């Protein structure tokens with residue numbers, strides 16, 4: 001288990017070739033596993049650091065995790081600056097021993113692809129005239145829970161306020177240090193920032209950050225999210241550049257019979273002008289392709305099976321690694337997802353909603369890596385073949401789904417969804433998502449204040 005520090009998921013084609021070689025020659029699985037934190041993992045390493053270090057990469061006592069950055073903003077010009085800041089924050093946080101791990105993101109509305117509510121610290125970019133001017137700071141997200149332990153809970157991030165760009169690092173440092181000092185000293189299961197905030201209060205924590213940073217937060221500046229999905233396919237960037245986002249199921253890059261995904265990406269890496277961007281949805285963006293190069297790149301991607309069309313449902317589904325490598329796994333996730341979505345696709349067709357999607361995620365155990373606690377429909381592994389079914393999150397990921405059914409099997413899950421998707425297909429309002437529908441229609445009570453109402 002080796003994971004690389006790769007702020008914003010930006011990796012060069014040179015670095016890619018180096019990791020492709022290592023994966024194929026020096027690991028049991030021979031795969032490259034894109035993670036939902038915009039980096040990659042090797043599984044079953046049989047020297048890694050010298051291979052990484054040789055291409056300018058480093059693997060993270062350090063309680064920091066990969067700093068995320070919106071991968072493919074609609075306003076393409078904004079990426080360079082936001083990425084610059086994600087990289088600066090990442091370096092600024094590099095070694096204060098944190099009570100628990102600390103996760104940070106840089107978000108560019110209207111996209112919440114990085115799933116900000118799953119993180120301790122989030123900087124939402126505010127731009128004027130195509131230039132970043134500052135950030136809205138949101139603090140306190142975290143999804144991990146422990147089965148049947150009402151003292152644990154998933155929590156969304158709280159708005160602190162707006163800060164001019166110049167105060168970014170001072171604020172980042174102040175948040176980290178306040179959490180370091182105030183984090184629960186005894187119990188590690190209560191050490192996370194989400195718990196600290198609930199114990200001392202948002203305003204108390206906010207006031208201390210201002211005191212330490214030497215600033216005063218301005219009121220939050222308007223921002224809205226429209227979705228969390230990647231922009232699969234070609235999108236026009238700046239100049240004559242184009243970005244091709246490839247859907248990679250479970251982010252598992254391996255050569256399969258008749259679908260040489262790994263080799264295909266290697267071939268693209270060899271002729272690609274710019275670099276690649278690993279997304280928070282475990283997909284890959286071939287970024288900065290000149291218009292004149294589109295056809296070449298597309299030919300390889302197409303021939304390799306990297307552009308095989310899937311339904312919008314599959315594009316918006318996610319699972320954590322789980323078995324066979326995860327030692328904490330309770331139920332299958334990555335290995336369960338493909339056939340599970342085959343079933344969901346059937347249900348969507350049956351109800352005439354094949355063109356629609358439901359943000360559906362499966363996490364192997366309550367640690368929550370698959371981010372099911374921010375999905376419209378989330379499955380949380382409880383035992384082999386059994387999961388807790390949660391419903392009621394929303395498309396943009398700002399609401400935690402309450403547990404609907406507990407410790408049930410796939411057939412039981414499918415039957416429940418068949419019923420629910422049917423009602424949704426027929427009773428939903430114009431453009432109303434599944435999660436919002438289950439809440440409006442009274443199928444599940446919403447989670448309004450996680451620390452107090454997540455558990456029944």
Ligand code: SRM
Pocket residue numbers: 001003034035036037038039040041065066100101103115118141142143144145192282319320321322325326327328367368369370371
């Ligand atoms: C690969 C990934 C899932 C995926 O399919 O993409 C992953 C994989 C693992 N996570 Fe994670 N987590 C992944 C994102 C997250 C997320 C989602 C996110 O960050 O966007 C969370 C939920 C958010 C949160 O932290 O609240 C998550 C919460 C954890 C936790 C519970 C943390 C907690 O605060 O309680 C653990 C267990 C622990 O640390 O004790 C954990 C533990 C683990 C480990 C390393 C298991 C272990 O402790 O030995 C799992 C390795 C499985 C394997 O064999 O590869 N992982 N993990 C993601 C790696 C991200 C990365 O590059 O760093």
Ligand code: SF4
Pocket residue numbers: 320321322323326327328329330333363364365366367368369370
């Ligand atoms: S949610 Fe549980 S099973 Fe899945 S990768 Fe994380 S720790 Fe392992």
Ligand SMILES: [K+]
Pocket residue numbers: 247248249250251281282283
């Ligand atoms: K994916």
